[PDB]
Amino acid sequence: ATLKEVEMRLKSIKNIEKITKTMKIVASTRLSKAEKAKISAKKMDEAEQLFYKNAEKELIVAITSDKGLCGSIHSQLAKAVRRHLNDQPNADIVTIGDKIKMQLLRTHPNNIKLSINGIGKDAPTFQESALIADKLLSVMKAGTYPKISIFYNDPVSSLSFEPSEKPIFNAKTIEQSPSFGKFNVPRDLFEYTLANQMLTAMAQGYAAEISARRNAMDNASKNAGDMINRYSILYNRTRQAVITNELVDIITGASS
Amino acid sequence: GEWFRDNGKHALIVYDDLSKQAVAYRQLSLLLRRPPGREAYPGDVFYLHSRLLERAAKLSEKEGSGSLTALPVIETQGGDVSAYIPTNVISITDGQIFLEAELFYKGIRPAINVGLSVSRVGSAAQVKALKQVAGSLKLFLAQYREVAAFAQFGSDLDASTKQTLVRGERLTQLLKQNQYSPLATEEQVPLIYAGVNGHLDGIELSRIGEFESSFLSYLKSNHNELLTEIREKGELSKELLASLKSATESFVAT
Amino acid sequence: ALKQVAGSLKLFLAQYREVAAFAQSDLDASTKQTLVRGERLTQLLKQNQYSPLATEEQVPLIYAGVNGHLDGIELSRIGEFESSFLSYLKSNHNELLTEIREKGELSKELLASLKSATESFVAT
Amino acid sequence: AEYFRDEEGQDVLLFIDNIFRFTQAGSEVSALLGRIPSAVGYQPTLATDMGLLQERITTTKKGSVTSVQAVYVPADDLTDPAPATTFAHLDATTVLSRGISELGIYPAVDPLDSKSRLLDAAVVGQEHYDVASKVQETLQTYKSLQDIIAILGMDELSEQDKLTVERARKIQRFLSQPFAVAEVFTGIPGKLVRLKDTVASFKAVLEGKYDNIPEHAFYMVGGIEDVVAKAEKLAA
To answer: Which of A82, A215, B16, B197 is the most exposed, fewest CB within 10 Å of its CB?
Structure first.
């Protein structure tokens, strides 16, 4: 490549490295709160677990990141969840997050029946989650579903995550279970525990998104370095060549 | 051309191109065994192009008000403006129109790099109406050149930043032009007015080429007196601005 | 005398040179201590034009920086400390400065006396 | 060739391989003739030496001459004054590139440095011009996204940019073609494609009809019919 074009591409790469460094800084800032929230929600699920463990058509629920640059984890996990749920690919899907909406194409993309937006603008919380879930229950009869699959990323590692999904079910899932002897309370449960599991999955997904971004954006910044190095080597080799030609020019100028 | 200049007439001289002239003079100078300089050019190539270009002038009313305008062409090798002749000519001239191949292949023709292109005479040379409407155009394109590079990096962005892309892309599309089809300033003013003030924000980016084709046909057919005023007077009064806005919004309603 | 403390100073400055570049996300306690040390010492590395310092005076300052004493001072005042400290050393500890000049070594007695003086002034 | 043009009254083909060697020989003898070298060591008379030769090859009112000139590019440097001077004379120029043959593309012509004065809607028609412009625009967009792709990978492009990159890769491979002369060393039977078929195929590809086909199916096939046939063979 010509020296000028080399300079142009090298400047582009350097600018990209800077931008990715800034996004890495932002991700590392969010990381602490994200992990603490995920741990807190996982612990808080124990209240519903204490009953659900003893008591023991299709729908789709997607809870993923609102924006890209979340590494491959955010979109790939939801895509794999859709591929696994493709045993009933026509299930009505309620989609939260742009990445989850895109990953929904692994199943039938026309199954969409509800949508949400703005998940990425704030930390996970039940304040707006409750209103969104109430609108979802009004629009989709989620309170009577035999099996509605809600998928969210699992932060299995400090910098890694794996796909996960859970089925929300109607009151009859608890009221009809033979083990219920260990204890419309069932419908109050199908509301409260449904919302609690939704919040826990949302917090886990947020923690996974932030960890994956903190890892992947730093990986991008590190990858920038190798190509920048080799292009710097090429640039300096070109500088050597042009310097040699300039020396030749002045030598031929002096000799005559 | 200096005959036209000195007899009170106006002339435009294009040199296509001065680099080949410098090559020819370098040939002459080296076959005469004059001392070579940088790139084996002789010492006085700057004196050459300078005493050539300094002949472009605007003469006073006492001298006959004649003028000669020079558009020297220069061919850079791989965009290397650091070369000897490009440096000399860029130093001598009162400005530059800079053409880039990457813009050409992105479909931006006539490929003028609005960032590098500079006119040192500036707005004093511009027609008053186009000076009026085009006031913010440079600012929006300057913002766009940065924000587009930011956006291609893949970062999500706020709506205020997105608006910069919305107008910048459509302005860059609006400045495209077909060869051998120059537009009268009468016809340019409405297009820049529509683009700058955001009326095009509602048009699909790919369809902008249709708008510029149809809008003028509307103005020529339904608002001909407005165009006649823009041409004859060359400046926009408050009433002409109001009428132009009315016509622009009437058409954009589609 | 200067070597004894500067050999330790090098280590802290290198550690800060690493940590600050890393941190530029809460800091671990050791890294926070490293940052405090590094910037407090940087406030000693700064010096005014045409204002050279004798070794008798460099040694106590680098001593207060190395042993972490002046970590008890807000950095934005270290300069005001550094001068007054020396003046205090001129009044209450002249023997220590004279011994640093004459012998050029921080003997155990002189080293402990300097520690005592630094503690006294930092408390003051 | 001039005798055939002027006095036989005939259309003439004048292949020249390789006209850089004329300038190179002029350079080789230059120093012994006492001339002061210029630039990177070429003779001062380079420009006029090329001119007195090239302006003779021209078509005239007595006859038509079609001249194909192979031009060497020393050290792959298109800024070297010899090819840089040669560019000014030609009407149609196609730049073969090492960086493209390194991808296994043949004839390895660079689609964003080849240019011809006939690529004009008044000459080739509107359909041809639009197809060619869209092809070049797509390839240029892909070239501009090369570095971002290398950094972040395809997973982080916008849907529009991802589709553009995929279509650009398919277009780039579809530009390859096996020549009969190359059968000896490529091992692939030669193909010859009409201009109409070329325009229609690239229009169809740009319209997205064939976007479901794998990239590998577009490589070194010929027309779009061969793309479909090779897609069938690869699927089996």
So the answer is: B16
Q: Are D39 and D81 in contact (CB under 8 A)?
A: yes
Cβ partners under 8 Å of residue C28, min gap 6:
none
CB contact under 8 A, A227 and D151: yes
Q: Is B154 an 8 Å CB contact of chain A?
A: yes
Task: Measure the CA–CA gap between C22 and A158, rounded to whole angstroms.
Answer: 19
Cα angle: C91, vertex C96, C98; to 5 degrees: 90
Residue type, D17: D
- Farthest-apart Cα atoms in chain B, separation: 71
Q: Which of B26, B76, B77, B155 to mutate to test the interface with A (most CBs of A within 10 A)?
A: B155
Q: Give the Cα separation of D63 and D9 in Å (integer).
A: 6
Bin B57: left if φ > 0, else alpha if -120 < ψ < 50, else beta. Answer: beta
Facing A72 at nearest CB: one of D41, D148, D155: D155
D50: phi then psi, degrees, rounded to nearest 5: -65, -40
Of A16, A245, A249, the CB nearest to D151: A16
User: Whose CA is closest to A170, among A199, A193, A190?
Assistant: A190
**Residue C51 is encoded by which pair of tokens?**
């204002």
Q: What is the resolution of this structure in A?
A: 3.3
Task: Check if the beta carbon of residue A176 is closer than 8 Å to that of residue A199.
Answer: no
* Nearest alpha carbon to residue C41 among C19, C23, C80, C68: C68
Q: How many CB pairs under 8 A join A and C?
A: 6
Query: Helices B185-196 and B137-152, interaxial angle, to 10°?
Result: 50
Q: What is the DSSP letter of B204?
A: -
CA-wise closest residue to D34 among B24, B33, B39: B33
- C-beta atoms of B80 and A2 within 8 A: yes
Q: Among residues B33, B120, B145, B167, which one is catalytic?
A: B120
Q: What's the token pair of residue C72?
A: 């008890």
- Residue positions counted in chain A: 256
Residue of D162, B162, B161, B149 lying closest to A75 (CA atoms): D162
CB-based contact A69 B154, cutoff 8 Å: yes
Q: Tell me the shortest Cα–Cα distance from B86 to chain D, in angstroms.
A: 15
Query: Is B120 one of the catalytic residues?
Result: yes
Which three-class secondary structure state does DSSP give residue B77?
Answer: coil
Strand partners, A154: A162
Chains that contact A by 3+ CB pairs under 8 Å? B, C, D
**B155 to chain A: closest CA residue:** A69
**How near does any CA of chain A get to the CA of C21, in Å?**
13
Question: Can you tell me the distance from the alpha carbon of B28 to that of B24, in angstroms, rounded to the nearest whole number?
Answer: 6
- C-alpha span between A137 and A195 (Å, rounded): 11
Cis peptide before B17 (omega within 30 of 0): yes
Q: Which two tokens stand for residue A222?
A: 């590190």
User: Residue A245: closest CA among chain B residues belongs to which residue?
Assistant: B39
Question: Hey, are the CB atoms on D47 and B105 less than 8 Å from each other?
Answer: no
C-beta of residue A245 within 8 angstroms of C-beta of residue D81: no
How far, in Å, CA of C9 to CA of D55, rounded? 77
Q: What is the DSSP letter of B197?
A: T
Query: Burial of B100 by CB count in 10 Å (0-12 exposed, 13-18 middle, 19+ buried)?
Result: middle
- How far from chain centre, in Å, is Cα A8? 33
